[PDB]
RNA sequence: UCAUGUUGCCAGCACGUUAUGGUGGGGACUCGUGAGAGACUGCCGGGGUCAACUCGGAGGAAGGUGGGGAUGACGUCAAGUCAUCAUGCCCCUUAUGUCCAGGGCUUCACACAUGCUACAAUGGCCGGUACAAAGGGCUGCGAUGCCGUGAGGUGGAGCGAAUCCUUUCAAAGCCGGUCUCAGUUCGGAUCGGGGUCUGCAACUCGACCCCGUGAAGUCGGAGUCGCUAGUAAUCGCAGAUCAGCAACGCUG
RNA sequence: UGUGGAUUAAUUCGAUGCAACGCGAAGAACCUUACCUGGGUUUGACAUGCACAGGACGCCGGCAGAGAUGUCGGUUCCCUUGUG
């Protein structure tokens, strides 16, 4: 666990977002970490592929990464 | 004998008594018995109450034990659900957490093989 | 190579410790497929354990047990006219010896002693005296081969 | 095995992990080795032709 | 108390076999025979065969319900009911029906209906609907009833009992010369007093020589339906009352359903035949 | 079909020799790519003239390319007009100085690949398949010391929708026998209606060659 | 059998003195492979048509085609492959073209198939004893030493290599102690913490490590498969696609 | 692990006893992608032939942008006079 992901474009976007103290739904393509705690309060519209599904960032949100915080595996598999 | 709450059977070696516990396993049985000073071969019947107290203090202070392993495993499980992680989603759908086989295998999670119509 | 005549067989040497063909065949039958030296040690210790519990030569005790287990008539699985008619056939000495030792090993591994060394020793004793599973199976097979003599004249 | 996909794998990737084999002679990306860098179906056909200096039938 | 967690389709046990003594649909035979369906016209012979089949189904349902205890698996209920109704010479019409692998249908709490018995166990404070059906001599008899397993809290007791009053209120509202939809309307009325809701999809179905004859009895106010009752129709009233809204989460066990809102629900199915002056229950003990 | 192992793919270490021969340490893949590129470059124009073989040997990294053709004059026309142009093209394409070697087959069509070439050209020439066969088959055996032949064809023969096949055998052609020296030649004509594959097996004799 | 002594083995010899052919030398022996010999009923006896063939004996390492492989005549089943490839034909040519973002392709309430693990004391835990070959290795083996519970980190020798790493190549086995026939020190699931590495990033979406996990399964029902000797079977090692591995796989 | 059944944007495609299902797949976080959602290119990501301008293209950077892509910053031809 040398270094988790930094979300470089999402990192710059979040820095610009929270430096102005403005909360915006970032249409975040990045899906490979929420390891950085500064993401709290930013409505990450996770681009699961079909759309940008919002996900909120919490304190205990660390330790697992950003992707299927909004699920992408739409599944019913039984009659629906 | 007396311990944290997991029985140590009458015909199990001391490491073997430990291995039953969720808190202590065979390798941790060896580690704890080396750190404390109890033989891995001696029985539960040959155990001393002072050694019981010393062992309990050592395991509760330097090892994740029944309570510590629960407050670790389940708390971090619900932690990875509450972050929306697909490790949490493997937990929810009764799947192995590391994304290994869920299609047919992984019965200990989803539950044994069955039969639909 | 059936359908062409008798099948050649691998020859068997005697035991180094004991020196008997029956002992070595018993070793190879108790031989869990994959290990021999450990199986040899197990059959050894079983034979010495039979020795002190009998006071005689383990090879002679094993011979007595095999005689008390060796069958004389075998029943095949020929289908005659869509009905299972059992045709007893006289057993050659090698086939009867193999059957006796196979039964001895199968009922040895069945026993519930601490080790299959002890289990095999107890099986040897219970076959030598005549109070084991192998002896009662030897009795039962002869009883069943005699109960169906009406089909014994087919001569196959 | 589209020619576009062949040029795509031949074009530079923006990540060090996007690189894969994509055997160039035919276009099959799977089951491509290092010592030869080809697919199995073309490997057998080249090998049976004898143009490869050294490969032959194995029989021991 | 602590609210029960969401159910998951536990390991489904094997199927309960059925002696051919009791017949089966034509699928069993050559697929080009198409001898199913039968003259659904309800003759009095088929009425008596229906009485027998419904009594058998009700007895098996009672056996399953008396088997219901905290710690008793729904599989045990299905086994006991199947033993009772096979001993009575009846075929489980739900076994293999469109892919249902069990003799009886066990709905648990949130499950709407046609739930699949599996390794899921019943505990204290639960509500369990058991659905039993019997087939003989070309008749189909289905009925489900919900029971309070353990010392259940007040709210779920109200839920189940209200489903039950909606049940016999729809049953008693059945009169000759009345439209079908009034039944559903009555149910909705009883749902409106306590603010409960009724699913508009899994509703009453006509029953007879075929399990589903196509006669669907909607359990809500549907003025667009002019289906008038005449004596002789055997059909199931199974009003469905939830603790939540009309959206639901079909259990991953499909047949088995569940309420999206994780709020518990109840179901009571009674098969009725219209007499010269009202309704008569043929699946009653 | 029947698992007929390639006679050149089966007796490549017994009777027949490899087209290419060299040694390369941690250099095999690039040599294979160079061989493939050179053979692709010499594919259509050479086969139209009647090319027979293409050997690519490697001297001390400079060049060794030999092309065995069945007719002189087309590959090498006016001195420098054709041979030097393709030599310069090879020099440009391959990162080496190419001293291209062009040699002529001593006899008329006598190779399995050459027979397949002639047969496929005739089939594309709208002639009677049978004629084409027999004709080119007669023009096949040839091979002075010839002992056996096996002419096979498959595909849309004559442009029909059915992928019919023909088999003709002459004399000893033991495929199974390893002292066979059976040359293999496969060529596919591209007809207006599709493709026709042509197989030729040429059994020179029973010589072991060991 | 001849040749063959280097990187390799080391009797006949010395030097190591620990690190083992390891070193100088040693062809003597494998080893290493170039050549060759040596199974061809080669000899004999017996039936048999006096024939094949067969049986048996003998020489022979191989015996009655030595053994293991490599041999696909004619054709067989529109089996499969326009997604290996071209390919006749049809369709789009501004899209079904086309690059990239993200996802899925790993999804699961299941059916089947195949395997590893078991279900133990023949074994589990702990420790010691001695033997494999093929290999594979230049940005790869990568060692010694160490921090490390252990991943993993350094780190680069000898290494394009019979030299050096893979250990002077194992495991099962041998022994000793325990465990005492049990949901077991079986058995591993199962997941959690924290990390550890690769990877831009390991939630889907790698693996590993320290710990803990101790389920089912107490040897399998109908029914079924394989195996004629190095065979069934057990154990371990290696190689390929592999930056990270789904591999309990495949090839040996 | 793969296949069938079901979801899905895709759960890529085909193979369906022998001769499919530890398969092509001897290797799916991007890639693999063939599928979908969305954003770009449109003689197109990729080419060939006719030109037509041409001395630029093209490269080294910055920025925006999920990225494709676009902006320009700086170099600006090498032939040899026909123009390539």
Swiss-Prot record, chain A:
Any single GO BP term: translation
UniProt cross-references to PROSITE patterns, sorted A to Z: RIBOSOMAL_S19
GO molecular function: rRNA binding; structural constituent of ribosome
InterPro entries for the chain: Ribosomal_uS19 (IPR002222), Ribosomal_uS19_bac-type (IPR005732), Ribosomal_uS19_CS (IPR020934), Ribosomal_uS19_SF (IPR023575)
A Pfam family reported for this protein in Swiss-Prot or TrEMBL: Ribosomal_S19
Swiss-Prot/TrEMBL keywords: Ribonucleoprotein, Ribosomal protein, RNA-binding, rRNA-binding
Cellular component per GO, a single term: small ribosomal subunit
Family designation: Belongs to the universal ribosomal protein uS19 family.
Role of this protein: Protein S19 forms a complex with S13 that binds strongly to the 16S ribosomal RNA.
Protein name per the record: Small ribosomal subunit protein uS19
Species this chain originates from: Mycolicibacterium smegmatis (strain ATCC 700084 / mc(2)155)
From Swiss-Prot, chain B:
Keywords, ordered alphabetically: Ribonucleoprotein, Ribosomal protein, RNA-binding, rRNA-binding, tRNA-binding
Residue ranges of the region described as Disordered: 94-117
GO biological process: translation
GO MF term (any one): rRNA binding
Pfam families in the record: Ribosomal_S13
One Gene Ontology cellular component: cytosol
Function statement: Located at the top of the head of the 30S subunit, it contacts several helices of the 16S rRNA. In the 70S ribosome it contacts the 23S rRNA (bridge B1a) and protein L5 of the 50S subunit (bridge B1b), connecting the 2 subunits; these bridges are implicated in subunit movement. Contacts the tRNAs in the A and P-sites.
Assembly description: Part of the 30S ribosomal subunit. Forms a loose heterodimer with protein S19. Forms two bridges to the 50S subunit in the 70S ribosome.
Family listed: Belongs to the universal ribosomal protein uS13 family.
NCBIfam families per record: uS13_bact (TIGR03631)
Name the record gives this protein: Small ribosomal subunit protein uS13
Curated annotation (Swiss-Prot), chain C:
CDD domains per record: uS7_Bacteria
Swiss-Prot/TrEMBL keywords: Ribonucleoprotein, Ribosomal protein, RNA-binding, rRNA-binding, tRNA-binding
GO molecular function, a single term: structural constituent of ribosome
InterPro entries: Ribosomal_uS7, Ribosomal_uS7_bac/org-type, Ribosomal_uS7_CS, Ribosomal_uS7_dom, Ribosomal_uS7_dom_sf
Coiled-coil regions, chain positions: none
Gene Ontology BP annotations: translation
NCBIfam families with a match to the protein in the record: rpsG_bact
Similarity comment text for this entry: Belongs to the universal ribosomal protein uS7 family.
Role summary: One of the primary rRNA binding proteins, it binds directly to 16S rRNA where it nucleates assembly of the head domain of the 30S subunit. Is located at the subunit interface close to the decoding center, probably blocks exit of the E-site tRNA.
Subunit architecture: Part of the 30S ribosomal subunit. Contacts proteins S9 and S11.
Protein name in the entry: Small ribosomal subunit protein uS7
Organism this protein belongs to: Mycolicibacterium smegmatis (strain ATCC 700084 / mc(2)155)
Swiss-Prot record, chain F:
GO molecular function, one term: mRNA binding
Presence of keyword rRNA-binding: yes
One Gene Ontology CC term in the entry: cytosolic small ribosomal subunit
Domain KH type-2: 38-106
UniProt superkingdom: Bacteria
Annotated GO biological process: translation
Keywords from the UniProt entry: Ribonucleoprotein, Ribosomal protein, RNA-binding, rRNA-binding
Miscellaneous field: Binds 2-aminothiazole antibiotics, which are antitubercular agents.
Assembly description: Part of the 30S ribosomal subunit. Forms a tight complex with proteins S10 and S14.
Family: Belongs to the universal ribosomal protein uS3 family.
Function: Binds the lower part of the 30S subunit head. Binds mRNA in the 70S ribosome, positioning it for translation.
Name of the protein in question: Small ribosomal subunit protein uS3
Lineage: Bacteria, Bacillati, Actinomycetota, Actinomycetes, Mycobacteriales
Parent-protein residues present: 1 to 210 of 275
């Amino acid at each position: 666990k040398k270094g988790p992901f930094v979300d470089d474009h999402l990192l710059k976007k979040v820095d610009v977002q929270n430096e102005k103290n403005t909360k915006q739904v970032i249409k975040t393509w990045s899906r490979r970490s929420t390891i950085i705690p500064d993401f709290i309060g930013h409505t990450f519209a996770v681009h699961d592929g079909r759309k940008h599904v919002p996900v909120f960032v919490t304190e205990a949100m660390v330790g697992h990464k950003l992707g299927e915080f909004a699920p992408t595996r739409t599944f019913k598999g039984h009659i629906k | 004998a007396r311990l944290v709450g997991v029985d140590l059977p009458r015909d199990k070696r001391m490491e073997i008594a430990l291995t039953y516990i969720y808190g202590i396993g065979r390798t941790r049985s060896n580690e704890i018995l080396a750190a404390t000073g109890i033989d891995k071969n001696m029985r539960t019947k040959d155990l001393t109450d002072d050694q019981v107290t010393v062992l309990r203090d050592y395991i509760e202070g330097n090892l994740k034990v029944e309570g510590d392993l629960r407050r670790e495993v389940q708390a971090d499980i619900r932690r990875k659900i509450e972050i929306g992680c697909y490790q949490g989603l493997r937990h929810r759908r009764g799947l192995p957490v590391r994304g290994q086989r869920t299609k047919t295998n992984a019965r200990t999670r989803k539950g044994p093989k069955r039969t639909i119509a | 190579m059936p359908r062409k005549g008798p099948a050649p067989k691998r020859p068997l040497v005697n035991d180094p410790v004991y020196g008997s063909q029956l002992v070595t065949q018993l070793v190879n039958k108790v031989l869990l497929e994959g290990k021999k030296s450990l199986a040899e040690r197990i059959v050894y210790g079983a034979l010495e354990q039979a020795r002190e519990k009998t006071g005689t030569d383990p090879v002679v005790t094993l011979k007595r047990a095999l005689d008390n287990v060796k069958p004389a008539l075998e029943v095949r699985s020929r289908r005659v006219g869509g009905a299972t008619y059992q045709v007893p056939v006289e057993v050659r000495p090698d086939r009867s010896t193999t059957l006796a030792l196979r039964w001895l090993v199968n009922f040895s591994r069945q026993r519930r002693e601490k080790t299959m060394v002890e289990r095999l020793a107890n099986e040897i004793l219970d076959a030598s005296n005549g109070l084991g599973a192998s002896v009662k199976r030897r009795e039962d097979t002869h009883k069943m081969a005699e109960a169906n003599r009406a089909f014994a004249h087919y001569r196959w | 095995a589209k020619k576009a996909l062949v040029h795509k794998a031949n074009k530079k990737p923006k990540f060090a992990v996007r690189a894969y084999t994509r055997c160039n002679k035919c276009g099959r990306p799977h089951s491509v080795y290092r010592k030869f860098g080809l697919c199995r179906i073309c490997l057998r056909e080249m090998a049976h032709a004898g143009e490869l200096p050294g490969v032959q039938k194995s029989s021991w | 108390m602590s609210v029960r967690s969401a159910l998951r389709p536990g390991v489904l046990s094997p199927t309960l076999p059925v002696p051919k003594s009791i017949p089966r649909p034509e699928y069993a035979w050559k697929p080009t025979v198409q001898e199913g369906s039968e003259p659904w016209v309800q003759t009095p012979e088929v009425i008596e065969k229906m009485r027998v089949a419904g009594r058998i189904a009700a007895g098996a349902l009672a056996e399953a319900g008396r088997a219901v205890a905290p710690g008793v698996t729904t599989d045990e209920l299905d086994r006991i009911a199947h033993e009772y109704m096979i001993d009575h010479g009846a075929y489980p019409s739900t076994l293999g029906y469109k892919g249902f692998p069990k003799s009886c249908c066990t709905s648990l709490n949130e499950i709407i209906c046609h739930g699949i018995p599996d390794s899921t166990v019943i505990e204290d404070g639960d509500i369990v609907n058991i659905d039993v059906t019997a087939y003989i001599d070309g008749v189909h008899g289905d009925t489900n009833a919900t029971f309070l397993a353990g010392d259940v809290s007040e709210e779920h007791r109200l839920l189940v009992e209200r489903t039950h009053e909606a049940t016999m209120r729809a049953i008693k509202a059945v009169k000759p010369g009345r439209a079908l939809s009034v039944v559903g309307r009555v149910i909705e009325a009883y749902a409106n007093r306590f603010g409960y809701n009724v699913v508009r999809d899994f509703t009453g179905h006509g029953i007879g020589t075929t399990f589903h004859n196509g006669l669907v009895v909607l359990h809500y106010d549907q003025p667009a339906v002019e289906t008038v009752l005449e004596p002789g129709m055997t059909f199931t009233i199974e009003p469905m009352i939830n603790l939540g809204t009309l959206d639901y989460e079909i259990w991953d066990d499909g047949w088995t359903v569940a309420t999206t809102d994780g709020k518990w629900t109840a179901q009571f199915e009674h098969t009725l035949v219209v007499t010269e002056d009202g309704a008569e229950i043929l699946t009653q003990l | 079909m029947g698992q007929k192992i390639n006679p050149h793919g089966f007796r490549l270490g017994i009777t027949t020799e490899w087209k290419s021969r060299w040694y390369a340490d941690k250099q095999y893949k690039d040599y294979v790519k160079e061989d493939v590129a050179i053979r692709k470059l010499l594919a259509t124009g050479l086969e139209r003239a009647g090319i027979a073989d293409v050997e690519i040997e490697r001297t001390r990294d400079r060049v060794r390319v030999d092309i065995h053709t069945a007719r002189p004059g087309i590959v090498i026309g006016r001195r420098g007009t054709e041979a030097d142009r393709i030599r310069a093209d090879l020099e440009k394409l391959t990162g080496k100085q190419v001293q291209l070697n062009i040699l002529e087959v001593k006899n008329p069509e006598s190779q399995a690949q050459l027979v397949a070439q002639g047969v496929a050209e005739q089939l594309s020439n709208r002639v009677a398949f049978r004629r084409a066969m027999r004709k080119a088959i007669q023009s096949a055996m040839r091979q002075p010391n010839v002992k056996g032949i096996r002419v096979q064809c498959s595909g849309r023969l004559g442009g029909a929708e059915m992928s019919r096949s023909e088999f003709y055998r002459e004399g000893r052609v033991p495929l199974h026998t390893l002292r066979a020296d059976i040359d293999y030649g496969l060529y596919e004509a591209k007809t207006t209606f599709g493709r026709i594959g042509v197989k030729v097996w040429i059994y020179k004799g029973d010589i072991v060659g060991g």
